[PDB]
Amino acid sequence: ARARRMMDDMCNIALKIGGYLPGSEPQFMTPGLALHLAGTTRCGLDTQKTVG
Amino acid sequence: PYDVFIAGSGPIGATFAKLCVDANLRVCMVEIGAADSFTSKPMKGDPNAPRSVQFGPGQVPIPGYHKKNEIEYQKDIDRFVNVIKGALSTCSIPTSNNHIATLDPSVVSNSLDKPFISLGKNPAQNPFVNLGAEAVTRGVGGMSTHWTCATPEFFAPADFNAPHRERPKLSTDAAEDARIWKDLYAQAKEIIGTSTTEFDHSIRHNLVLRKYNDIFQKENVIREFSPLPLACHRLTDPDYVEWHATDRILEELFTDPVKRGRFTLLTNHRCTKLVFKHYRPGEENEVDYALVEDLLPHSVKKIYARSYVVACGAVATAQVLANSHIPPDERDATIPTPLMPMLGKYITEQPMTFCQVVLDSSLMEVVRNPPWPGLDWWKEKVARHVEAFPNDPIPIPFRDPEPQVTIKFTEEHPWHVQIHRDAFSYGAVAENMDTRVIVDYRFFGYTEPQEANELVFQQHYRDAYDMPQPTFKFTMSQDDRARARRMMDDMCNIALKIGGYLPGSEPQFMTPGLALHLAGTTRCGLDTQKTVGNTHCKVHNFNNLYVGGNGVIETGFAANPTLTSICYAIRASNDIIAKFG
Amino acid sequence: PYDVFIAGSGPIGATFAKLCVDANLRVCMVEIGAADSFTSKPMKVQFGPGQVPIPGYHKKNEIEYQKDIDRFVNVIKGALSTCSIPTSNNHIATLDPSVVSNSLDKPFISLGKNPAQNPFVNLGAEAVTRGVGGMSTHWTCATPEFFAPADFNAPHRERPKLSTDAAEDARIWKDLYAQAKEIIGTSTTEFDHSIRHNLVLRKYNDIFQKENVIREFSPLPLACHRLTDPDYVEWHATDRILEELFTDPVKRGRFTLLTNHRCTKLVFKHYRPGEENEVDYALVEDLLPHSVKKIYARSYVVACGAVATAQVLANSHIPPERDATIPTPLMPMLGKYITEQPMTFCQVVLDSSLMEVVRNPPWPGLDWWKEKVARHVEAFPNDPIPIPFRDPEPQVTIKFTEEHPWHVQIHRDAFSYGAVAENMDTRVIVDYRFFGYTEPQEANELVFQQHYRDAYDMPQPTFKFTMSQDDRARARRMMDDMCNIALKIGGYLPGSEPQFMTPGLALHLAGTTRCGLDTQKTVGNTHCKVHNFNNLYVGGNGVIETGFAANPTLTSICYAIRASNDIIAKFG
Amino acid sequence: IPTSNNHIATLDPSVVSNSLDKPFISLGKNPAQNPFVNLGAEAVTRGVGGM
Ligand SMILES: *Cc1cc2c(cc1C)Nc1c([nH]c(=O)[nH]c1=O)N2C[C@H](O)[C@H](O)[C@H](O)COP(=O)(O)OP(=O)(O)OC[C@H]1O[C@@H](n2cnc3c(N)ncnc32)[C@H](O)[C@@H]1O
Ligand SMILES: *Cc1cc2c(cc1C)Nc1c([nH]c(=O)[nH]c1=O)N2C[C@H](O)[C@H](O)[C@H](O)COP(=O)(O)OP(=O)(O)OC[C@H]1O[C@@H](n2cnc3c(N)ncnc32)[C@H](O)[C@@H]1O
Ligand SMILES: [Mg+2]
């Protein structure tokens, strides 16, 4: 639900100062492209749900 | 002489023919293209008619039938895109001299100062002010053999002196203007067969229409969604629709032997030009004859009539009339048209944005359990499908018709919205998706009429039919641009309420001219100094010369023009009947 | 009862109709598609009173397509319905995360796909056209004969045997091919005043006369005629075959053509394999809205093309687990030994040195050429290409031989040029299409699904096709031959470098209802009568039992003649 | 990178090919990966200073 709203937000924002360049129209990217994977050795206060 | 000569056999030329032959006039129609799409109807009075099968004895073929009516295309709808592409001839293709660096070094090549000279290109066209996708269809029925059949009315504001209107003025009195339009639209809708109810039992249509109205009732600005008026009727087998075309306009001129004897249709015959009484600008004049050439070998003919109608579409009507400025017997020079000085000036065409979406997964639950009353037909169809295909993730039945939804133009959101499906050619990523959950969006804007926007015709370059090469000089205004941006924004906002963009069909502008709604090339109206013809589409200074088609329309409009152009063809035909009957 | 019932209105069905009506037989022909392409001719101005409309006219005859030939590719694509498209379940990684999607365990169930087709043994580009005239409303009209070797016991031949006697076989084929050529209007002269055609043909002959292995180039035989206005060609189609059945009211009175009518199946006297049988009636359905008819005739002909002929006959095995096919024990060789042609393709741009040939041809006496070049050069002095603007394409072939056993066409087909390629002028492009053959093998088959159906509710076709080792060896040689030949006169156009095409693209599928002398390995005899049925005949490329490389229509017309004559003898 | 067994319909018929029964076994693919629950663009950089 947030992903859809994000996409809607981007279209609204971008169009305030320009128009989409052909080939680079609004689109989702392949999952993982951000390279911001996290939580694989997750650390925090809840000992039973964390690695550290 | 014939009573009426008509160049062009699209739905406008056919309306003139129908009305004039129904008023007992004798009509000669010429069409540059072939008869290439047919249905079959019983000939009236033939004793074999009751028994008859299509195209068998007792029946007559009727040209100008919609090509999408063939069952193959009702079953495999995305194949129709190829038919449309096959039917469109691009008006103006500019030259280029690009280097191909990986040619084998022994082969013929272009160079910097020997470019190719290639058949089919227009050396005078500046690519930057072109309508590069503006195209024509030559054939009996014109573009009506493939059109999508949308027939909206044009918007008329509550204030008659509002700064913009889509519907042109036919009178300077607001009440009479309204009267006239209500009569013409009623008759145009009857001629073409407009309906807003032929998708009333589609799940997809009702899903989209009702959901959008529910969503937009809850927003700060209210927007109304309605069925798109379409010239079609769904058949007694509801899996099939008959899309309407020129065939229904011409029908009785073929089936009725009395009407047939007053109608002549010459196919593969080009109207090259009209020949006038004299060539002096500003003075009363008359057409003396039409110069027509038979393009098939078996040929130049003078056709005499009392009145002449040029209904060759927006490019070609102007083309014929430009060519007519060269009486019979600088490389980039164009043909001056001092007899019709506003010809090809104030041209308009619609900017267009497009996208497709995949419907939200959440809407599939609405399909399984819809909240609106009066939908037992929907529930039953769904239950049948779910029990026949219990592993199908999509609960929409397999042959459910597509949606056919519009938002009518308003001054507050001054563009025309279609939410539907057209045939489309899926790429390698997008053809992995099921057709049932795709919805297309096409938003059309308007452009202001400006004298400097023009269609002109080359003296020294010719098209494939030996007619003067068209050249476009088209640039949108700052206000046109601003609306076009708002339009794109609106399309993104609306599309994303019910689905997410399909890869390869994300929000984009299309090539200028792709709408094919070019107008104002022979513009008709009350302002005599800025128009080619009057509100009856009679050309100024010519007592017996009429024009038809989208070219007569003098406003900047965003909605599909065909219905309004039929109104003008009515109005012009009635003038011809009164003067020449 | 009619005398003859015919399912299908392609050029084969039309040949049976014409010959049977000419012999005073009453014919009912049914065609699943629409009449959608017409000309008009006078009864014994086009589309007025006095003229009669004739369906099955070639779509390319419309002037629009003679003036803009590359547009005609859209017409062909619009006409072809792919036979068997396998299912797939590809992940689309960039869908918006809220939209309907396939998953590993819940794939889409999509109209128009064949879950039973293994893609690795498919003919993925095999397709059909449904309409009056079948594929003849868009075909390229090439009508060569098939190769018959000097030795009647050669291990391969293209032309099937119609007798076990060599001389008699030769006599029969000589008569059939002459009559076939007249029916369809074959000519080899319609490009003889093209500069491009003559440059290609004469250059290649000059080149290959100087090589130690001689190869002969000749004009491609085409069912067409150039009109009196030589910018135009009338491409022939089923209209020419049916013409008299429409224009002569006596003949019109013996011929009924029902369009949008599916031959769903034939119903037989009984369903016991191996015993003499007959067709009782055809089950036909009117698909147009305004129901099911039994149509009775003395004889029945299924001429529905290679796939759909076998499809009707398979469906007829049903009197009126998921992947199970329809068993066909009444016709046990139905769909077995199927053949299709591997094809290689490229395009070249002509060598720059050939333009000086165009300017000053070295062959004497070509006044027509020099005059056209002179007019061009005077009107367009800065054109670097001296070939005239509306100069017709080349239409050149090398006839199949056993030493180079493929069929070569050197010509221009309608083509959609990419972003690199359409910067090149069309006058200097030449296309190469090389077609090979595949040996008939029992395991290569077309079968029909019990529980899957096509868009017209017929049993879904499924292909199982794998080429042999010798077929592959020949195909590599064919590719090498194409590279060698093409590079003599030009260089590969970027984007159209030498490549194999998708199997089935040739649309020369054969052997699905194979006819011949070996009763045990055939569906029908050399008169195309189905074994054990006294009144059932088949027509089309599916009857051809050999592995052939050349274009099959002319040869199928020969078989339609021969079958028609058997029908006329027996049921006249 | 998940495995796949796509048919290449235009390969020269004499060449090495995959089949329905005998897919390629190709270095660098993960036979365990379901493509529909993948992070197909997740990637690493090996070098001093990492990414
Ligand atoms: C191609 C197309 C068109 C439309 C839609 C979609 C597509 C892909 N969708 C559509 C449109 N219009 C609407 O209002 N609603 C929609 O959903 N389409 C446009 C519509 O199709 C046109 O507005 C309409 O046909 C215009 O009718 P017309 O004014 O009669 O003009 P046509 O172009 O149809 O026919 C002209 C006719 O004249 C012939 N001609 C041209 N030159 C000559 C000469 N010199 N001599 C004789 N005849 C000539 C043409 O060949 C043509 O047949
Ligand atoms: C599409 C195509 C075809 C060929 C060439 C190029 C292209 C792009 N070029 C060509 C070919 N052949 C040659 O010899 N030389 C060339 O240059 N083409 C193939 C050629 O077009 C065919 O070989 C020829 O038509 C075969 O004729 P036919 O045996 O009469 O078969 P058709 O497929 O033409 O017509 C069959 C007909 O039957 C109807 N049908 C199918 N099922 C039914 C059922 N159940 N009921 C009733 N009718 C049925 C089809 O609709 C079709 O009309
Ligand atoms: Mg009505």
PDB file of C-alpha atoms in Angstrom, chain A residues 32-49:
ATOM      1  CA  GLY A  32      17.365  -5.578  -4.344  1.00  0.00           C
ATOM      2  CA  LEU A  33      18.728  -2.918  -6.649  1.00  0.00           C
ATOM      3  CA  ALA A  34      18.870  -0.443  -3.765  1.00  0.00           C
ATOM      4  CA  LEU A  35      21.515  -2.673  -2.098  1.00  0.00           C
ATOM      5  CA  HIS A  36      20.141  -1.617   1.305  1.00  0.00           C
ATOM      6  CA  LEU A  37      19.394  -5.187   2.509  1.00  0.00           C
ATOM      7  CA  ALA A  38      19.302  -5.156   6.253  1.00  0.00           C
ATOM      8  CA  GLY A  39      18.247  -7.252   9.301  1.00  0.00           C
ATOM      9  CA  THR A  40      20.390 -10.292   8.303  1.00  0.00           C
ATOM     10  CA  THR A  41      22.298 -10.151  11.656  1.00  0.00           C
ATOM     11  CA  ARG A  42      19.853  -7.886  13.424  1.00  0.00           C
ATOM     12  CA  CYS A  43      20.851  -6.164  16.657  1.00  0.00           C
ATOM     13  CA  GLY A  44      18.658  -4.634  19.263  1.00  0.00           C
ATOM     14  CA  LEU A  45      17.099  -4.753  22.725  1.00  0.00           C
ATOM     15  CA  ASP A  46      14.771  -7.780  22.130  1.00  0.00           C
ATOM     16  CA  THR A  47      17.120 -10.718  22.793  1.00  0.00           C
ATOM     17  CA  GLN A  48      14.708 -13.397  21.551  1.00  0.00           C
ATOM     18  CA  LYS A  49      14.295 -11.764  18.131  1.00  0.00           C
TER      19      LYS A  49
END
